[model samples]
Target: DKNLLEKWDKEYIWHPYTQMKEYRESKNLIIERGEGNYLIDIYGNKYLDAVSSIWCNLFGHSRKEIIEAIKNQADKICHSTLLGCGNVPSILLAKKLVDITPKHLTKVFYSEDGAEAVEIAIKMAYQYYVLRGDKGRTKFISVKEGYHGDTVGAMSVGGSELFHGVFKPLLFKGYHANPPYEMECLNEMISLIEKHAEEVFCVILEGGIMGSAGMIPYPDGYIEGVAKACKENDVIFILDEVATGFGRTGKMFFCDNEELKKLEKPDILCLGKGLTGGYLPLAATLTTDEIYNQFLGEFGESKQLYHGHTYTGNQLLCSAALATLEIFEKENVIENIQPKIKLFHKELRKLKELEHVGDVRGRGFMVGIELVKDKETKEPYPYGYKAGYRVAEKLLEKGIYMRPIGNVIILVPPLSITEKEIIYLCDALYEAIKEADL
Candidate 1:
């Protein structure tokens, strides 16, 4: 039924991150429905959702509780202007977020997507410095190859050339620090941070692991060092947990990692994507009261935070997020993910013996397999080959859906995936690489 609908889709849809010329000639995969950890296509063929539906669906697809919560909220109210207005679900969800997130995150500002959430964080951080009479510290720092989101402010801080290449002229001045890539020199990373820490208003990092930067997990003490540097230089630490939050990294949040906890908690934390169990677009930027206090005053005062989206604190999305959190708590989803992480690591280790395999690195379900031409030299394959994309296309034909970020194949399945499915994902990925002859 949906394959018939695909014809209509091709005519009307202009998808994101797609080459329009190639798409017009090539058929798109038309998925009709999703079950626990699988997507059913129009022909009823099922595929393991290895990329967690583009790294958003934390629990899984069509989860009963989340669906029911959204349906129930719809019965009452769907959309309301949250500016200067309040709603029950939105209010409750805000309280829940403040409680569950890091202790310093005392306030919640809502948005409709991850990019918007990041935009809010950037603006808030900039305003925080300006309000405190430190307007000279207006520039922000971000890790190289780190992805925040796609909005202008978000893209300005984002380091990936794949997304920000064309927007350089339009972007604000954002400092870049080298993320802890084992292939790169760590000492150089420290130098970059030390040199720019003074001018930075905030150091925005994708805590623990850089998701879009090929799941490059930082060295054990890297975040602590960065946080310390920020503190010494009066730079606010901002953690982008849009992908790592909600137990995706085998913890409630990557910030829960002992080493990360020792460092200063982020002055601002941006969260979304799995926030509503992939059911809705709802994002929130959480900040400490210290930052919040600067924006507080009477209505006529310039101290108030003037930024907000029309859909800020939307009720239905809030209901979905509350329900998703309930499921996470009851299922102990983070605890359940540990063994699977071990299994994935063990299986991925075998790929190191392959000629083209450069690195296999990640924590929990966020894994990356970097394919290179010369493993000894660690040289990535030429971009023209599009090796990662080709491998992913082959895997999709074999009932697996994995997203390849440049030369790295990314695996971020739903946290609820069973051990058997984990094995299936690994095996399918290995076969994809072999079939691609890389």
Candidate 2:
């Protein structure tokens, strides 16, 4: 019975981040539909989506407003070239974004995905320095364990070995510093920044909350310190809010925090994922007026930034983004999620007393549980043991969907989850951990 589905998927689909040979032996769960925070498998099993479909769907799956907006836009106008033309939804969405983001970000460059946004931001920073006659400032500085998108330029700057190790020969040179994961390497980060500040064109960060690097939140004042160092040395401070934006971290954007605001506002802000409530792929790179002015004036000024996607500002995506913003406002989504967040934290704190639980850290709905081999040494389980993956597999069997990043089990459920649902999820995860014997 399952052979037909498996045969078609195996023959036609090339899945991402999967080893094809190993995948062929295992049966993939075919998700047929989604409602609220639950995904229904083809076999009629319902699983709570604790990871929110790779941290994209903020409001949840098959949201009515989002679906309606996409349908309406498809009927009206789906595609329009934003290069020399304009559309109402695109214009309105851009204005709405500027209104909500940090005050310093006055310009928005539309892109189709997070990688393109990071690519644009990196190029913008490099070009800004060239226009100002500081061509020597071309190198980029990024934090280690950071996961930016998979584009070549983005891969060059991101220091994650998991994705970029094999492509080392093709990658560009980038100075990397220790990511803020408690007091483990804060001093080392400062030293590296101080050493390369002058040569660095920009310092790209994962903002206050790190997502792919195991949902690691920075130590207090760490992000601010990096911001200050970048400012003093004339380096562009680029905040990659691709994952932490749109109230994921209990704030509209991670940069909105007082400590981050004090240490120079980001020169470039990357927004994606929840921008359109995961209804369509849309990303924007927001920058200061100063950066925009550099590329201003006549088209052939030689200073004009010449980068754009054919579907740069697709009207359908713009409509989806506008609708997402409206839903956020009308539904009071942020306020609604506040109590749920508190309950989530309370439940997560209970894991702190567990022997194998190394750390439980997060803000809002984004949480991470690090597993360890020994409580005394805080030593992580051997990578070969795949402790996190074991827990994730157990949870999946029990109709709970979660993802493991390295040794950390990450939870980034949709913001619309209720307190009761959260309790159910917590209980399911607790049992899964115990069953996995981790």
Candidate 3:
């Protein structure tokens, strides 16, 4: 049975971001199920899921509460379009989101994933200015290497040449500033926004940390500083929290960081991934009444946001999301993760001593361990050498699974992971990097 399953996978499944030529020669390790924070393969082999199923899974696999919520909602309805009518779960989840997020964000728009949510935000930003007779504000300003999603509009606002370079001809025109890893970059970003204020509709960036962009965290005060710039320059500000939201960055939302929260707030906030505890796909774009009110008019006037997804507010997904939020309150998820976050970073420090580990950096549960060819000069391994891939493979053999982004190994296990699990992951990673020596 397992042999046939593996054959079917190779023949029919074209995995995302995968090279099939090399994959066809390797043995397939098809995952059959999951338990706690571990994935059990077809042969019943268990391995720690160190990447939280690709930067999601806040609670973990097979979370009983989330599963129960989904099942209960399925008995009533599964799908519903949010274009005309509202569903029970979506309506409640929207309220919960507004309550938990920064006070400025008051309205919610639903979508299927991070990319779709981002697409909605882009369209809304562009349309908001056009409705106000400021049609010249047509372009956007985003951070370099800051990933939003893969859709056309989302990619247009994103700045990853490694992923979006080949599609340049199809992408739109936008300005990209270096991400504010330092205060100087923060000032430069504000200057860029001010320079193009009239033409720029929005200044968008991943909140707290640029997760997909190699887990790069922003410098202190960078986010609020950008928000302040956007406000002063008359540009809408958007925070894409797709990968960093829902306790990934030790806060419910990255924009809630102390120093950042004290200043300006983003006009638009995008959420996904952990929104449903990784049980299903669900994303929301939230905004304040200041922007949302501009789209209000009579039915004949046609002043409305013009986007809709087939499963825009699927009841099942929303119910799971509602449960996820409830768990955050009931279990005090954010407060409990504080010490675990400290331990996670403490364990990760061990990797910095390894000869190949160029830099180990992250916050909360998100981390990126970069491997270099020369530690002294910080010379990176040649592109396409798959140095990170080799280390990940070694980690896999040692009963932990992680994915690599070029030479950077990502480790974002479920926030619910125990102290013992954290030590296990760190230990395996140390040995794997030492052995791979990439």
- TM-score per candidate, chains pooled: 0.95, 0.95, 0.98
Which regions of candidate 2 deviate over 4 angstroms? Answer: 182-191, 262-264
Alpha-carbon RMSD to native, per candidate: 2.0, 1.8, 1.1
Comparison by lDDT, 1 against 3, better one: 3
- Locate the minimum summed-lDDT window of 10 residues in model 1: 181-190
Instruction: List runs of model 3 lying over 4 Å from the truth.
Output: 258-264
Mark the regions of model 1 whose C-alpha exceeds 4 Å error after superposition: 1-4, 182-198, 259-263
Q: Which is the winner by lDDT between candidate 2 and candidate 3?
A: 3
Q: Is candidate 2 or candidate 3 better by TM-score?
A: 3
Query: What local lDDT does model 1 show for residue 295?
Result: 83
Query: Between 1 and 2, whose TM-score is larger?
Result: 2
Ten contiguous residues with the weakest lDDT in model 2: 182-191
Residue-wise C-alpha lDDT for candidate 2, range 279-380, written one tens digit per residue: 689999999998888877776677788899799999999998999999988988877878888889988877787778888998788899999989899998
Residue-level lDDT for 20 in candidate 2: 78
Candidate 2: TM-score? 0.95
The residue-by-residue lDDT of candidate 3 on 1-438, one tens digit each, is: 988887888899899878998888898568989999999998999989899889889887888999999999988989877779888899899999999998878999998899999999999999999888896887899988988888888889998888878899999888999866777898899899989999988999998788877887887778888888888888899999999899998988888866555544688999999999998999999998989999999988888887886899899999999999999999999999999999999988888888999998887888899889899999999977999989988998999989989999998989889999999899999999888855
Q: Name the candidate, 1 or 2, with the larger lDDT value.
A: 2
lDDT of 1 by residue, 113-170 (tens): 8888888888888888888887477687777788988878989999988778898999
